[PDB]
């Protein structure tokens, strides 16, 4: 339990120095990084913790879903459109949006129906997340357990803490990756796999400096 | 005693809740290897039960010493686990796609020669998956990874757990082994399904030697439909 103890590796490595007074551990992914001083209030700290974990889970899902179709298309899978920031336009295409390019799957043709279904279902599930519903009741805002851990991988509290650290670390990495995806898609104009393939060959000029001159005023 | 526990106890247990999971598979009440015609003599006096999946079938004078019996149990378990994996992996690619996609080669005994072809081995016939074309690299990776795995098996034992039933956190994530009774019942199930898979592998070898493939001779012949 190196992370949870009063001596943890911190975000500077061995040469860390000052650690915030309130950050005594007791939380997954505690690296003593509060340079902005935003979570000084305890309730604000709890709200920011909730935001962090929800964002981490959403970003892990987003990174997986932004990488998988592109990797499949590169590997040889047929798609109507595979670029992560272009996949939304398939609903406005004549062929329609078909899962894995198969007309026998989903075969969605209207955007309004998708929007209405998403609004209704996500409203229901977020209301459940805030007030408890069919899958259980609110015990901890972030870690409900029970029906959402059916296999019981977090029965042991020590293993529970270790899994918390693992999940938060993977999630923060995924969040950083999603920010990278957004900025690279708006700068280069090609998918993450295209950028990686460009960096694979001739990395000297396949970087941000190549496009550093595209936003000069004039 | 996780959530999977008491769930296996209610549903997955093979005996009624009032009756323990011992008597039908351990003790003097075992079904024995000749059914209702077994007779006392055909059960060796040292095969008294008390171990998973024994039917008193030692026609030759093997075992008869505890060390031999325990060893042979361990090789039986290992061959059985590997045979379960082998049979399911031999039957999955032929089920998912029986066509001869150039990089696929669904036939189980013909995929070895697929590496020497130009198309190589394309997982699920996807051109960008692995696409291996060298047998020597596969040889080296097999040697290194399996040497490490088996060295960890026979040297990195926790010195407190069973060599072939380690249990613990890593090998029992769902905690099926909370109760010794259901643990013994699960061991019996594992042994029996493993033996079934071993016979499936032997029959697969024989029928591949004689007849063509697995789906055919099961859909082409003997089940004319």
């Amino acid at each position: 339990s190196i992370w949870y103890g009063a001596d943890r590796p911190k975000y500077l490595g061995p040469f860390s120095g000052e650690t915030p007074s309130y950050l005594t551990g007791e939380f997954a992914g505690d690296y003593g990084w509060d340079t902005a001083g935003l979570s000084s209030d305890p309730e604000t700290f709890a709200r920011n913790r909730e935001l962090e974990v929800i964002h981490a889970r959403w970003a892990m899902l987003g990174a997986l879903g932004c990488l998988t179709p592109e990797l499949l298309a590169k590997s040889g899978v047929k798609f109507g459109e595979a670029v992560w920031f272009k996949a939304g336009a398939q609903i406005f295409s004549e062929g329609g949006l078909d899962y894995l390019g198969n007309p026998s799957l989903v075969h969605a043709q209207s955007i309004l129906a998708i929007w209405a279904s998403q609004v209704v279902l996500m409203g229901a599930v977020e209301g459940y997340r805030v007030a408890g519903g069919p899958l259980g009741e609110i015990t901890d805002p972030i870690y409900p357990g029970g029906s959402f851990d059916p296999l019981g991988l977090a029965d042991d509290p020590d293993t529970f803490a270790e899994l918390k650290v693992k999940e938060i670390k993977n999630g923060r990495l995924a969040m950083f990756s999603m920010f990278g995806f957004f900025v690279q898609a708006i700068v280069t104009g090609k998918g993450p796999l295209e950028n990686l393939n460009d960096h694979l060959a001739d990395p000297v000029a396949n970087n941000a400096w190549a496009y550093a001159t595209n936003f000069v005023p004039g | 005693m996780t959530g999977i526990a008491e769930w296996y106890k209610v549903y997955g247990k093979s005996v009624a809740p009032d009756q323990d999971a011992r008597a039908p598979y351990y003790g003097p009440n075992r079904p024995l290897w000749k059914g209702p015609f077994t007779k006392p003599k055909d059960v060796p006096e040292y095969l008294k039960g008390e171990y998973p999946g024994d039917y008193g079938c030692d026609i030759f004078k093997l075992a008869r010493l505890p060390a031999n019996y325990a060893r042979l149990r361990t090789q039986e378990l290992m061959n059985g686990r590997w045979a379960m994996l082998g049979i399911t992996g031999c039957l999955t690619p032929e089920l998912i796609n029986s066509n001869s996609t150039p990089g696929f080669e669904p036939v189980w005994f013909n995929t070895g020669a697929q590496i020497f072809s130009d198309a190589g081995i394309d997982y699920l016939g996807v051109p960008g998956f692995i696409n291996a074309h060298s047998l020597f690299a596969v040889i080296v990776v097999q040697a290194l990874l399996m040497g490490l795995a088996e060295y960890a098996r026979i040297k990195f034992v926790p010195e407190g757990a069973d060599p072939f039933y380690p249990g613990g956190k890593t090998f029992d994530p769902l905690g099926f082994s909370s109760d010794p009774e259901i643990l013994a019942e699960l061991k019996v199930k594992e042994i029996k399904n493993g033996r079934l898979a071993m016979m499936a592998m032997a029959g697969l070898f024989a029928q591949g030697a004689v007849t063509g493939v697995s789906p055919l001779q099961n859909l082409h012949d003997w089940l004319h439909l």
């Binding site: - | 549903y11 093979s14 009624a16 439909l225």
Partner: protein, 81 residues
């Protein structure tokens, strides 16, 4: 006919209904549903070999409901598609 779509739909419907019967995902003889659909436990004087309490009455009921749902689905799909 064995590999046909109708056969697959019928076998899937019957299998799913039986699965929801044997495991406590649907009402059965030994598991009564309340006004709130809660599946409380009920004791019936029916003896079965299934350790989970699944009886022959439950087998017949789940098979019947599965055949019914499968026929409805097959006819609806044929009429639409």
């Amino acid at each position: 006919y064995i590999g046909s779509s109708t056969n697959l739909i019928m076998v899937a419907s019957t299998t799913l209904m039986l699965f929801a019967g044997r495991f406590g995902l649907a009402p059965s003889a030994n598991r009564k549903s309340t006004a709130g659909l809660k599946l409380v436990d009920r004791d019936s004087g029916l003896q079965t070999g299934d350790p989970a309490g699944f009886t022959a009455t439950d087998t017949l009921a789940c098979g019947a409901l599965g055949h019914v749902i499968g026929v409805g689905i097959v006819l609806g799909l044929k009429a639409t598609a």
